[PDB]
């Protein structure tokens, strides 16, 4: 499992309010958080599928 | 019909304005509510189809 | 966890070749399968999010 | 509810494999069916929410 | 065309600003409006094809 | 309305099967047809909204 | 091309902020503008494809 | 406009039948074609806005 | 690669909050940025694939 | 850069023609391949954005 999947989700400094998915290491599944629209870190997925499959 | 299908919709603490679907037991079908983007409860569906079939 | 999440995925008799998601009880996560487009059973989700959240 | 809501789903002659939604009076909910692309009848919805709200 | 197709469009008390279609009986065509995310009335269509097929 | 709104729908030579909208001068509204993927003619719209707005 | 392809883009009175396309008669192509959600005018397309096809 | 915008559209050896846009240098506008799913050449756009902004 | 690929992202003046993609020469890949809705500059892509293929 | 980012794309045994993204290490960016719809390996991304960030 990529180390980056253990990083807290990261909204960044931008205005948008968009759903993205991140791996919650502790709950052990992908959840939703709000993403500003810029300067994404790696635990950030457009698609929940991609999320589970990358950090499952 | 899972228990969670009877809990009221939960916006959550986040500040997004994301349309979602919850099963309305009183009414007997899925309806739209506004989801804040994080900390979702289980009566929350990105897809209306998924909502009617899971809670139908 | 809804009992229906333990049912094998079910393509049905229709022509379409569409991705949908089902809960693989054994692997313990949601995966892709092909859905014919009609006569869905309950372990079938338009959205991977909805899938995890309903059968996680 | 409207009366076209009582018609059976019509795939029509054309060759596309597009998921659409029809009200199924019997089961009392909107379901998926394959629409062929041309010559649709009235019990036929692009959006499941439209179907639940119109024929629900 | 069903009676509700004559109801004026209804935004609702919710906080989203999402595009929906309504049948405008005067002009005799479907048009856009802003729906606020919840408590939609029946003359409210996510898809335009559904609006004109159901009300036009 | 533009004179192109009257010409029949042109599926074209290509092999794809994509739902597109066209103005049905006779029936007075926009209906679906199957576009092939190339050599489109002008009575051909990706969006049903656009079709009614332009040819309605 | 239709005479409506020349009129300026009409954002309108409504509160939404939706990206739409319009024909820029001057620059000779379709550009983006922000539509408000209601009282659209005809130089307004949901699909960029439609815009170039109609006004190009 | 970059040179590749002049390359004719390329379907590829793959088996899908997906709509894409290419700049057609003769006509001087972007148009549709069928891409087969793999080994796209650069004059191949998922979005039309991107095609005309990049090649038009 | 084209030279507009070297420009910095431009949000422009308008108020929408739409994720778009720009090539970031420094990091050597396309990234997200917020586009405002009007007056886009050329290093601006609706689709990430378009961005990677055009400026990759 | 996870190991899986270097495995070749895998269509799988299913018969869908679903566009997806894999990271091409040889080329140094994500490209499209055709995914059969089941039994996906990890170098499979519904979203190009997710692909470039996970394997970039």
Curated annotation (Swiss-Prot), chains A, B, C, D, E, F, G, H, I, J:
It is found in: Secreted. The record marks 15-16 as: Reactive bond for trypsin. Disulfide bonds join 5-55, 14-38, 30-51. Residues 5-55 form the BPTI/Kunitz inhibitor domain. GO terms for cellular component: extracellular space; serine protease inhibitor complex. One of its GO terms (molecular function) is protease binding. Keywords: Disulfide bond, Pharmaceutical, Protease inhibitor, Secreted, Serine protease inhibitor, Signal. Its main location: secreted. It comes from the Eukaryota. GO terms for biological process: negative regulation of platelet aggregation; negative regulation of serine-type endopeptidase activity; negative regulation of thrombin-activated receptor signaling pathway; trypsinogen activation. Inhibits trypsin, kallikrein, chymotrypsin, and plasmin. This is Pancreatic trypsin inhibitor. It comes from Bos taurus. The chain holds residues 36 to 91 of 100 of the full protein.
């Amino acid at each position: 499992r990529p180390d980056f999947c253990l990083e807290p989700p990261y909204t960044g400094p931008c205005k948008a309010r968009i759903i993205r998915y991140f791996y919650n290491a502790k709950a052990g599944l992908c959840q939703t958080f709000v993403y500003g629209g810029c300067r994404a870190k790696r635990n950030n997925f457009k698609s929940a599928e991609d999320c589970m499959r990358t950090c499952g």
